[PDB]
């Protein structure tokens with residue numbers, strides 16, 4: 001058998017806001033967090049815009065001195081995590097600290113730190129590399145620093161599954177609790193790759209929208225005029241908790257995590273198969289895990305990156321899985337507003353899926369002006385749609401053909 | 413209910429050999445793989461030696477056209493994975509490809525590739541960044557490329573827990589199989605951090621031995637004259653397989669994976685606590701997981717990094733866990749010979765633990781000329797010790813206070 005897992009705390013930094021409620025308010029209003037990137041000469045770059053976190057104050061969380069040791073992606077991870085633990089009301093004690101763990105991940109990790117230390121190295125040689133370069137740049141330091149700060153002695157690890165990281169981190173944390181390896185986990189992801197290396201790296205693959213004249217219209221999932229994804233920064237953290245543990249302390253439960261699916265496409269390094277066979281296996285795995293019929297799904301938070309082949313693969317996968325129910329569910333890409341937070345995408349989109357359940361509303365796909373060939377599902381174009389949502393899916397489909405699906409259900 | 417997990421295939425690149433048998437012959441002969449580094453000019457660095465893979469031929473595994481796109485850590489990971497799969501005798505079919513997954517991790521991933529593309533960005537511009545920069549550098553792409561080449565459609569992910577990566581990857585892959593998420597997993601880790609940023613970064617932390625004039629004597633775990641770890645490159649992969657699945661196809665079984673432990677120190681970003689409290693909690697978790705009396709433990713492949721604080725913390729942990737039995741078991745650090753393969757350390761050392769079971773021999777801790785204060789266990793100083801080994805334990809500890817323990821035993 002298996003224990004039930006509930007969500008009792010959420011935290012976030014996104015292009016829409018410095019916490020969950022501000023980000024969510026932007027989502028339901030169809031606001032874009034996309035704009036030209038500042039304090040950087042992007043003259044020679046083919047993309048000059050993305051989703052930056054605006055007005056982040058790390059000194060609300062850490063001393064200036066501890067913040068100087070950590071890459072931005074680690075700072076963002078810690079902010080989301082501290083928000084989530086505070087939101088949960090959880091009290092860490094000597095009696096439970098061995099039962100509380102962390103799995104906060106990243107897709108690309110410390111590019112900003114790698115950049116600034118390469119500068120030192122190339123200009124001045126290796127003796128000018130920061131002593132904290134390694135511990136301050138590696139992806140497991142969100143989990144590391146969080147565990148040290150809060151005294152968490154439970155499972156301590158980090159996933160890195162590129163654009164699937166957040167979804168996998170949450171799913172595998174849910175497994176830790178379900179199979180009795182932990183009673184509580186902080187899980188999700190963080191990313192800051194809106195540096196030269198991220199813009200330059202994705203730019204050289206020609207994977208980014210180049211709609212520099214109108215950055216807010218760049219991210220347009222399933223629209224016939226999409227030309228690639230928008231690079232964005234931020235973090236998402238959830239407090240996952242065994243149900244009886246949540247009930248005993250009188251926690252506020254947002255939703256239940258009922259299903260987790262994984263699959264591999266085994267197809268291509270960056271592109272999905274046209275029919276999204278892998279994404280279909282992954283969703284079917286997640287519904288089987290939850291013991292749910294495809295007919296019971298009401299809302300899907302799509303991966304919906306605004307890549308030509310990715311968006312169309314997801315339509316095919318949803319039609320394949322849901323058959324005569326594919327048109328009755330609502331599916332939206334909040335990446336139309338947030339851009340693509342890569343490893344943090346699945347974390348912020350799990351939070352948006354939980355809030356869709358709490359508020360009984362499907363977030364919009366903004367910029368969906370002319371749906372492409374066969375994009376004829378309910379994609380919640382332009383404006384938020386109040387509706388019945390008992391079951392929400394959140395999908396992530398990343399480089400290496402790695403797939404994750406989370407299934408959340410209303411809790412009463 | 414929980415299924416049994418066996419090892420049916422193993423693969424390796426190490427400083428001692430281009431496969432498992434050649435690496436193991438070096439381990440048993442007390443041979444060092446440590447030498448001045450030849451692939452770059454280290455005259456400005458305080459450490460100029462490490463464990464390099466010597467004469468790696470990627471054209472034993474991959475077309476030169478493909479290899480040119482991939483960081484060395486991906487090449488090394490794919491080579492070890494290919495070896496492990498061939499060694500298993502497993503045939504991938506339409507009937508089982510959904511049940512076979514991959515979890516190959518890395519501490520740092522494609523630092524060489526990121527450094528080289530940062531040089532292009534700074535000296536020329538973004539137009540000179542490689543189109544293959546992201547899929548050739550990010551940590552999840554061993555799992556990705558392996559799945560694409562062999563057609564593995566099962567769980568596809570990657571851990572990054574610094575120096576604990578290989579142990580966590582293998583343990584969590586075993587849990588996947590134990591709980592029914594997969595029947596077969598390819599699991600382990602790979603690392604190639606021997607570039608300017610890696611040697612410079614660890615150098616800036618003063619974490620490395622600076623014994624440049626006697627590289628083979630630099631790695632001296634528990635020796636009173638140790639002065640830091642020796643940086644090494646390579647990969648380990650194991651094919652983990654559900655027991656009945658292995659029995660049904662007549663697989664050769666090397667050993668059974670009976671126990672997996674994790675814990676967080678919640679102590680310090682980089683320093684292990686002197687009392688080894690987190691390592692002790694981790695080993696106790698693993699022994700309880702394996703249903704064992706601690707007196708059953710015959711052999712411990714120590715983390716044994718040759719740091720002052722790391723080596724003494726492990727003695728304290730082993731004494732605390734095993735009490736008087738700590739004087740009867742054998743504990744050795746193969747890092748005395750291989751150096752520290754970081755995220756790959758746990759993977760090669762899991763392989764060495766299994767071969768310790770197959771051949772009934774404890775590998776030596778070379779260079780243990782003057783055991784330090786309180787390092788008075790059987791540390792298999794200088795020479796391999798033939799002995800009875802029914803149960804072998806492999807320990808890993810990493811930055812962020814992250815701990816892993818694997819427990820293997822003979823299969824009958």
Ligand SMILES: C[C@@H]1CN(C(=O)c2cnsn2)[C@@H](C)CO1
Nearest residue numbers: 269475477478479481557560561
């Ligand atoms: C493994 C796939 C295919 N590949 C090749 O270089 C290749 C080699 N033989 S046929 N194609 C790159 C696109 C990497 O991803």
